[PDB]
Design an enzyme around this catalytic site. Structure first.
Site, mmCIF file in Angstrom:
data_model
loop_
_atom_site.group_PDB
_atom_site.id
_atom_site.type_symbol
_atom_site.label_atom_id
_atom_site.label_comp_id
_atom_site.label_asym_id
_atom_site.label_seq_id
_atom_site.Cartn_x
_atom_site.Cartn_y
_atom_site.Cartn_z
ATOM 1 N N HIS A 1 1.508 6.908 9.594
ATOM 2 C CA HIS A 1 0.510 5.738 8.873
ATOM 3 C C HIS A 1 -0.219 5.186 10.421
ATOM 4 C CE1 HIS A 1 -0.751 1.525 7.011
ATOM 5 N NE2 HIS A 1 0.074 1.953 6.223
ATOM 6 N N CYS B 1 0.945 -1.032 -0.365
ATOM 7 C CA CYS B 1 -0.228 0.114 0.235
ATOM 8 C C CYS B 1 0.657 1.139 -0.106
ATOM 9 C CB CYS B 1 -0.765 0.498 1.195
ATOM 10 S SG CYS B 1 -0.501 -0.229 3.023
#
Ligand code: NA
Ligand code: NA
Ligand code: NA
Ligand code: NA
Ligand code: NA
Ligand code: NA
Ligand code: NA
Ligand code: NA
Lengths: 335, 335, 335, 335
Positions: A177, A150
């Site tokens: 994140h 990702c």
């Protein structure tokens, strides 16, 4: 349509299913997962961050009835024994985590699917593909493909512009994140020994490691080795931000040149904004990376510059939409 | 006993009071805050992140009785009208936001205080001081001093070492910072007009502008203009981390060399650690900055390097420890 | 279409804007708020809990263009100076907080609007309406109306089915409420001197007073003064749950009886579910109240019972849906 | 010196250890847990809600050194094989969750521990004890004893007062409870199939069943079956609140009665406060339960009354404080 099977009904598979309902020409005909279909439906119907499902889901014998279509379910740990032969499976989206080795993902091929896309970084002699960055490296002779990570999909298009319009010397990364489900809920022993992921996930700023910058060379060979970096996991359930700080070969570089070079490469995968947004504004988006021009920064001291840029991404749906793009292209390489 | 006055009983101002209980020699004798005493007492006694007040607090006639001691309480908007000479104030801690200038803060001096420490950056012709980094510049002739900001206090000891032991060319900074009380609870107009500080604080990764790095040279004049950067506000209530990515003039540096150099600079302002910790582990610590060697990185491509380091701090109590240290040293220059 | 004007573009007003985009025959033609347009567009465009705005927002000369329609924007302190005569305003949706009184709201009529719906409880001689519970008491003679509170609309269908099918003797309410913008981000003093709203919102469980229960008689007059309650504010940004604990005069009541009575009374305002859902699952929904059957409880000790029921409601968008429903009704009383 | 063994070093385990340091007379000589000592020692020094360990903790050959004491470390699945004989274990704290039945826990006694306290509700021919509530019932004959649950300890001292002083007819309970480690971090299948514990624990209001109220008879037998209840687990990481709604025999009861009743029965287990506190304020408290007199309500409709009360507790340290009380009391019952 293109007949897709999903192996694994985790966050990724469930979002890939949702996403595919929005993409014409793709139909998920099969979902394989160890969980009972009752619980699977409930996690499909309801989603904390991606919202209620658009439609009706019901468990029927042998699978689910979803928006008036049949999805056949299986609870089969050996993927070589799934009936991909008689379902005419075009592509398998591999989302289990137990099949990220190419030799191990060839089971889907032996079960008679024609192509498999691993929804993770993968080992073995396969190609790693970030859509709209290097899928033009696919010639159709491939049967197993990595969908990268990702974080790679948020990074690659930014790094390719940096390097292409200015020389890239080297650079470092921080992805602020969202926390993930492999982090613990409360302070407790962690299953892989990670002392930081061992900690209550929604109460802490938690450093951790990321392979994405170090691996980028698999997608952009000409900068292989030139990047490295880390992560800091923070208490938002989804939504992410990749900061990148680099040294460029081209001298006297402006904020405005950087921002302009990124805008010039906008497309469906690579977005571009100048709005003052926060992470929750990118939850559910379908860009692979959303370059944020409000954060471009050039530090100059004499002839010597540090350049810093930041791109947003929903580490769930940004990555899902890029998977579904690649998933479809693999199919279209069958003529 | 050094007679200490606190102006403004906010987060900064109440933590100062608390920290001063643990420092012998210093005594808070007066608190000025427009808020009624009853509520102030309540926010002293209870603290969401910092804990119950170790002791006993109660509202008496002219203020509070804290641990068998008298704290005078005023509700006075005009500093120059405060009875500082009446009380032989040795140093005022100025935490209101309204006197963050040399000539403005001068009001405290006219009111009787011997000296003033501003708990914030400040305009004017005053010195800005980070204890154990540059408080040696104080020559005793200063009546009004800035304690810098909570980010500067965590940056300075690190930049100093990097500049001293290796040659700091330039750098860039990101603080993954807890959210603060000037961010909105829910999405609403912002009183300063900030579109990001307007969003819900505990629900977002929010980019923000930081002053510290751009103004590091009031503390360390020899690296003036070589640092810049910003913050990412995230959903923890306190506890922060400062990432620094830099270019050095010594070009064969190692992680060991960096960490050892930081440990060699260790003291009661500049902590050192190699424990894999997270943000809630530094909540309430009295290091102004806690370097984290586990996060040091050196990136080498050819013979050009980039180095990244990081250091923790309680954006509250760290800053607070440094302010009380500089408080005491300012009252020490009676000698 | 019915021409709507929204006074006050806070959470309630921006959500009312959004919902009206999904009702045919309803149009927002003007918005009044003292905040600049640039900030208001940004807040309509981006929402933390309700999602990216569906469509396109732009700031145009005299206001906004949204989905191809112009919306006039004013920053007018004085309500009775508003061009509602010229905009042919059928209903003003009053959402500022300062005009929560019948006689104060007349100013909108004096400005030429036809009807005013107050998006909050109001005082003075007027009617308090919960759609699909008591809106039939509206005859057409009213110029100003109150739509009660978000907590009222959640409780009212439930309490009516309880009082109708069994006799309600008494009851007590606890709503597990999302925290709101009137709570502080950090521990700090509070506008109305509330020692609990003064505490960090996203970090505590916070008791707080309610009014929706003591005031149920305004919407259901036969149970007047037979309910009371309070709230517990917890760290979800939107989404609430109301628990009601009642004493009935009907005597051998069962869980099935209660649930069935609730299911039968289901409509567009009153939802019914048996899924095991959580708070985020009702974010954005349009039921004014969603009855949760899985939560029903009957305690029987001898011939004496206690019943407990519970209903979900998106304290934002559920109340928005209810208001819009009542707005439409007020306009359909063009005789 | 009572020699204590701790089986399982989870939250309950590590906090019991921490609590034992500040109790003169008890020492933990041994700890058994299958996780490696290096990780366990890390999770003792650093705690997210409870703070850094006050003291020094190091790993040594054969276990831990903590504050200049040796603590022997094993990691044995088989309880019968543990050397409790040789170490003269006076009591074992059973904190693994897998011995929650008297013939399961016996495995410690055969191993030569004199007594066992199970840190959870447990089944069998044993006794269930809430210190300072029903521990008067111990006679010295028991070798295995359950400590009940972190909500039972919360509920029991409030129930008792209500029963003795007014006569409890019946009642229902809701506890607003911090989220715990058995809840998922992200939406995923759950270990026990619970569809509500399958959801992101820190982003939701989550209903869940609790046996605490139903099984109150094990502690106060004279109100067995008279209570029932449930939980709402919200995004706070520790700190909880038990709200009770009851019917009483004695009528014309005032708030001031209920409150003075609870004031008089207050001890070192059962606290009493009239301050406007919130959950964070009770983190790390060592009352088993703290009565909140600001949340007492007496609904009087005509003749019949409904009474509500509430009491806080830290589901971690409040329980743990209670255990270490009962545990100590079991050891001194070996004269
Ligand atoms: Na499709
Ligand atoms: Na399955
Ligand atoms: Na002192
Ligand atoms: Na005052
Ligand atoms: Na419409
Ligand atoms: Na305006
Ligand atoms: Na001890
Ligand atoms: Na062990």
């Amino acid at each position: 349509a293109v007949k897709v099977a999903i192996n694994g009904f985790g966050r990724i598979g469930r979002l890939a299913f949702r996403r595919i309902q929005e993409v014409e020409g793709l139909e998920v005909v099969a979902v394989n997962d160890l969980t009972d279909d009752d619980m699977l439906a409930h996690l499909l119907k309801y989603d904390t961050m991606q919202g209620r499902f658009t439609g009706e889901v019901e468990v029927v014998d042998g699978g689910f009835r979803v928006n008036g279509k049949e999805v056949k379910s299986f609870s089969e740990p050996d993927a070589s024994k799934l009936p991909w032969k008689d379902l005419n499976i075009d592509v398998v989206l591999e989302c289990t985590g137990f099949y990220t080795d190419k030799d191990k993902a060839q089971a889907h091929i032996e079960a008679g699917a024609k192509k498999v896309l691993i929804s993770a970084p993968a080992t073995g002699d396969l190609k790693t593909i970030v859509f709209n960055t290097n899928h033009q490296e696919l010639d159709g002779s491939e049967t197993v493909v990595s969908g990268a990570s990702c974080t790679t999909n948020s990074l690659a298009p930014v790094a390719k512009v940096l390097n292409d319009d200015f020389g890239l010397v080297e650079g470092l990364m921080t992805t602020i994140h969202a926390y993930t489900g492999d982090q613990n809920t409360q302070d407790a022993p962690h299953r892989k020994g990670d002392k930081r992921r061992a900690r209550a996930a929604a109460e802490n700023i938690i450093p951790n490691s990321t392979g994405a910058a170090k691996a980028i060379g698999k997608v952009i060979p000409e900068i292989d080795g030139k990047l490295d970096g880390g992560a800091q996991r923070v208490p938002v359930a989804t939504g992410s931000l990749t900061e990148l700080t680099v040294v460029l070969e081209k001298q006297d570089v402006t904020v405005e040149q950087v921002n302009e070079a990124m805008k010039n490469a906008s497309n469906e995968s690579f977005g571009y904004t100048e709005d003052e947004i926060v992470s929750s504004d990118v939850v559910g988006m379908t860009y692979g990376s959303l370059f944020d021009a409000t954060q471009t920064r050039v530090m100059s001291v004499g002839d010597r510059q540090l350049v810093k840029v930041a791109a947003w991404y929903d580490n769930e749906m940004s990555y899902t939409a890029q998977l579904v793009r690649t998933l479809a292209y693999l199919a279209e390489l069958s003529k």
